[PDB]
Amino acid sequence: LSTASVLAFERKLDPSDALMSAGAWAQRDASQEWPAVTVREKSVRGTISNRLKTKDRDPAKLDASIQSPNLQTVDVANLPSDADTLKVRFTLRVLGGAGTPSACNDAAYRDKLLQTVATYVNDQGFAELARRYAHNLANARFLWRNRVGAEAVEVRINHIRQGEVARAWRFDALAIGLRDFKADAELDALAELIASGLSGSGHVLLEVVAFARIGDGQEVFPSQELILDKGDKKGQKSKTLYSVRDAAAIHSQKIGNALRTIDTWYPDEDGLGPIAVEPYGSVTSQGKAYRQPKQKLDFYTLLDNWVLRDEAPAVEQQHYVIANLIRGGVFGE
Amino acid sequence: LSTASVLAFERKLDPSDALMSAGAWAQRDASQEWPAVTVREKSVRGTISNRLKTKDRDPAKLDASIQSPNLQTVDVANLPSDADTLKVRFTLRVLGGAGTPSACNDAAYRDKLLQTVATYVNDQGFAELARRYAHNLANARFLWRNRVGAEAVEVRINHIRQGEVARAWRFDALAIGLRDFKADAELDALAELIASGLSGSGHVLLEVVAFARIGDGQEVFPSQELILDKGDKKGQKSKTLYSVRDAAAIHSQKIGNALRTIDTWYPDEDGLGPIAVEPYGSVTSQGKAYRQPKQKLDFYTLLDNWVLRDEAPAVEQQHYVIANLIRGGVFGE
Amino acid sequence: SMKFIKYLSTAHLNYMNIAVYENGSKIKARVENVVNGKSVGARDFDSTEQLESWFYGLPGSGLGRIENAMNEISRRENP
Numbered sequence: 214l215s216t217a218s219v220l221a222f223e224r225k226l227d228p229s230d231a232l233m234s235a236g237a238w239a240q241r242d243a244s245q246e247w248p249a250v251t252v253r254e255k256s257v258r259g260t261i262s263n264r265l266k267t268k269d270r271d272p273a274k275l276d277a278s279i280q281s282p283n284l285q286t287v288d289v290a291n292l293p294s295d296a297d298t299l300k301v302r303f304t305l306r307v308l309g310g311a312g313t314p315s316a317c318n319d320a321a322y323r324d325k326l327l328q329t330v331a332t333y334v335n336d337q338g339f340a341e342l343a344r345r346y347a348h349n350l351a352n353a354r355f356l357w358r359n360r361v362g363a364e365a366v367e368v369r370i371n372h373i374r375q376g377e378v379a380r381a382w383r384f385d386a387l388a389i390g391l392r393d394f395k396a397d398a399e400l401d402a403l404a405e406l407i408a409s410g411l412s413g414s415g416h417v418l419l420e421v422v423a424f425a426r427i428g429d430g431q432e433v434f435p436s437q438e439l440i441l442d443k444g445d446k447k448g449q450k451s452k453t454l455y456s457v458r459d460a461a462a463i464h465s466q467k468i469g470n471a472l473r474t475i476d477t478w479y480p481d482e483d484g485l486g487p488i489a490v491e492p493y494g495s496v497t498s499q500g501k502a503y504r505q506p507k508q509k510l511d512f513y514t515l516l517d518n519w520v521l522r523d524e525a526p527a528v529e530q531q532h533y534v535i536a537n538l539i540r541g542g543v544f545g546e
Numbered sequence: 547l548s549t550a551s552v553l554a555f556e557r558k559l560d561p562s563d564a565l566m567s568a569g570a571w572a573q574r575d576a577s578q579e580w581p582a583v584t585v586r587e588k589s590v591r592g593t594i595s596n597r598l599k600t601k602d603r604d605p606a607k608l609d610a611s612i613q614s615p616n617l618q619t620v621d622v623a624n625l626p627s628d629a630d631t632l633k634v635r636f637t638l639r640v641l642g643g644a645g646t647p648s649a650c651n652d653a654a655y656r657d658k659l660l661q662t663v664a665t666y667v668n669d670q671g672f673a674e675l676a677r678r679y680a681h682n683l684a685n686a687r688f689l690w691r692n693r694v695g696a697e698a699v700e701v702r703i704n705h706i707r708q709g710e711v712a713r714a715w716r717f718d719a720l721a722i723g724l725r726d727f728k729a730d731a732e733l734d735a736l737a738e739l740i741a742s743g744l745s746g747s748g749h750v751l752l753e754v755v756a757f758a759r760i761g762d763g764q765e766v767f768p769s770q771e772l773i774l775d776k777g778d779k780k781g782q783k784s785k786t787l788y789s790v791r792d793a794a795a796i797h798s799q800k801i802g803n804a805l806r807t808i809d810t811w812y813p814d815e816d817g818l819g820p821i822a823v824e825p826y827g828s829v830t831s832q833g834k835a836y837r838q839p840k841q842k843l844d845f846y847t848l849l850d851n852w853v854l855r856d857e858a859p860a861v862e863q864q865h866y867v868i869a870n871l872i873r874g875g876v877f878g879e
Numbered sequence: 880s881m882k883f884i885k886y887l888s889t890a891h892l893n894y895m896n897i898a899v900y901e902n903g904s905k906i907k908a909r910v911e912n913v914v915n916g917k918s919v920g921a922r923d924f925d926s927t928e929q930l931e932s933w934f935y936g937l938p939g940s941g942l943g944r945i946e947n948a949m950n951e952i953s954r955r956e957n958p
Contacts, residue, residue: 219833223691229763232627304761308695318833373761376571416697418761439589439617441782441946444938451940455588464588465765492595493612502612506598507605513597542595594891596914603916604883607898611913616891617942777919778953780895780912782946 214321214521217545221316224541225308225411226346226472231463233433235296238426247300249460250433252288254450259283287452290461294430299359300422303468307410307417311539329520333531334412342536343407345475348394350403353386353423354471358434364426372406373418392486435461475536478529479503480510490536512537547654549853553877554649559679559805564636564688564796566766568629574757580633582793583766585623592616620785623794627763632692634756636801643746644872658853666868672744675869678808680737681727686719686756687804691767696758703736706751725819768794808869811862812836813843823869845870849877881907888945897948906930910952920953
């Protein structure tokens with residue numbers, strides 16, 4: 214058997230864009246009406262700070278650079294001066310059916326993949342993966358830099374059965390760790406809800422709301438946009454923040470990245486911690502791709518061994534391959 | 547006597563471009579005014595997770611390629627954050643008399659085809675094809691990726707005579723199944739109305755209104771505008787969505803392809819579900835060449851057998867041929 | 880014999896970047912798709928110092944500057 218020339222997987226655990234708004238702590242119970250954080254605009258005069266080439270380490274060149282203007286315009290997002298917390302809400306659909314590809318050529322590779330994922334599910338459920346996704350919902354990984362240096366963070370998760378809420382949860386994102394994975398009653402209830410959602414045995418719709426007590430007027434961090442500073446008139450603003458109508462927003466894929474930070478068996482070490490699930494699993498923000506294909510832990514290697522040749526890897530790498538299938542992607546040649 | 551070489555069967559059951567709007571569930575009854583979903587803009591920083599070679603590629607080149615991000619720009623479309631229902635509205639002209647073409651060489655072949663289509667109108671008017679078109683209208687095949695993950699899908703179908711209504715059905719696309727085709731009294735009524743509408747008995751004009759609870763802020767999927775990109779003009783942009791005057795729309799081609807899933811007796815398989823009805827009938831996404839021309843079960847060779855040799859296979863193959871001529875297209879090279 | 884040196888940017892743009900090859904005593908700049916290696920236009924150079932004086936002489940800052948670079952190389956050089 215040869216693997217197909219076209220593979221595809223739709224994503225499960227698909228979130229929406231976050232919506233940031235600010236208000237007061239101990240008023241977060243009545244928070245359906247808080248005004249949204251807006252993206253304003255300020256001016257910055259920079260400086261000479263990058264490394265010199267050491268061929269330009271002259272007195273006169275540095276003095277001309279210091280007399281030279283470095284005026285820029287950037288976007289900033291702050292709280293109002295009387296608000297000290299940040300409300301962030303988004304919804305999350307849990308689809309299920311996480312073994313069936315949405316596009317395939319080979320009808321034999323398709324059926325082999327189906328009973329391979331099926332004997333994974335029969336061997337053990339989605340319980341460990343849903344435990345780790347319930348952890349990344351429990352703490353506030355989707356608050357990326359907003360969590361860093363916060364007084365107290367709190368996460369509210371509701372289950373939406375109809376127009377009315379069915380099941381609720383109330384967490385503490387600082388006491389619940391960021392480094393390991395633990396057990397608790399409400400964590401295991403949320404993990405079993407996610408595990409029932411991933412096995413096609415129900416419809417799960419979760420809205421998640423996070424509150425981060427930072428301080429009055431501090432700088433919140435919406436996600437930043439890609440702009441090409443080319444040669445237009447006089448230079449434009451050099452930092453664009455993502456927004457929607459009258460509200461500063463985090464992208465959906467940034468929250469989706471912060472949910473799938475699961476992997477703890479990339480072959481480097483346990484000193485760093487969990488990284489995001491990824492084929493050729495690469496933390497690009499530190500420029501190093503862990504799980505290189507020069508070892509035998511790459512996702513394509515594990516897939517082509519465990520589906521074609523029917524040799525099973527360790528249980529931890531089985532969790533890695535099923536989390537890759539839940540992620541979605543463009544697989545095949 | 548040979549047959550005509552230049553033939554052009556024409557379009558029939560023409561749907562309009564489906565427009566999308568957004569509002570709240572259970573207030574969908576008095577909804578003719580919902581604001582249109584519009585295509586927004588955002589930026590993407592991703593890794594490179596596609597398959598990579600081990601021949602004729604340097605190790606340093608792939609280490610530099612995986613560890614460096616990819617900064618593309620894509621289009622999206624979401625619901626508003628207080629609106630959880632995707633409304634899809636489109637109209638459907640049902641013309642009548644799709645038997646004869648209007649591009650013929652041979653006059654003897656043309657009125658011979660008139661003889662056999664008057665034979666089919668004589669013995670039994672359009673019944674099982676009308677069943678299958680009314681049942682594809684009954685579920686939400688026109689909702690392609692909008693269907694899966696929704697907890698409640700409704701189809702409302704009105705009929706047009708003047709500035710007034712003639713009949714108001716109501717179809718539950720979750721209760722009505724996806725695969726096994728059945729019949730019910732409202733489905734009998736709609737299939738009878740468009741059964742009259744197919745055999746040239748007059749004029750039938752429908753408009754179909756759909757609703758779907760997905761959740762506030764979630765991703766909708768309008769169709770994608772194509773671009774060639776063969777070599778040069780690579781581009782900063784990817785994923786160009788399709789639009790109309792300030793709205794997010796679905797193409798007529800793909801909602802028509804959603805209407806034309808009829809054939810359950812294709813010779814490759816019969817339990818995987820129906821495929822698209824076309825000459826050399828094979829779905830594009832799978833890529834497997836279903837309905838190989840080297841059997842007698844095409845539209846080409848089967849029509850050449852059925853109009854000259856005057857023989858016939860079982861009645862279902864003739865239902866496929868009549869669905870081919872209601873579809874339209876080109877017969878001959 | 881074209882030994883790879885470096886990519887010209889930190890980030891890829893649309894799976895597209897500029898690879899730098901050492902072609903003898905000259906030096907090559909190819910506009911390559913990073914996942915399959917399909918080149919859509921190259922330009923000869925000799926020294927890395929003049930190549931950087933050409934690249935930093937382009938209008939723009941960062942990915943806009945390498946957009947200018949790929950638009951400059953990706954057109955046919957006139958006779």
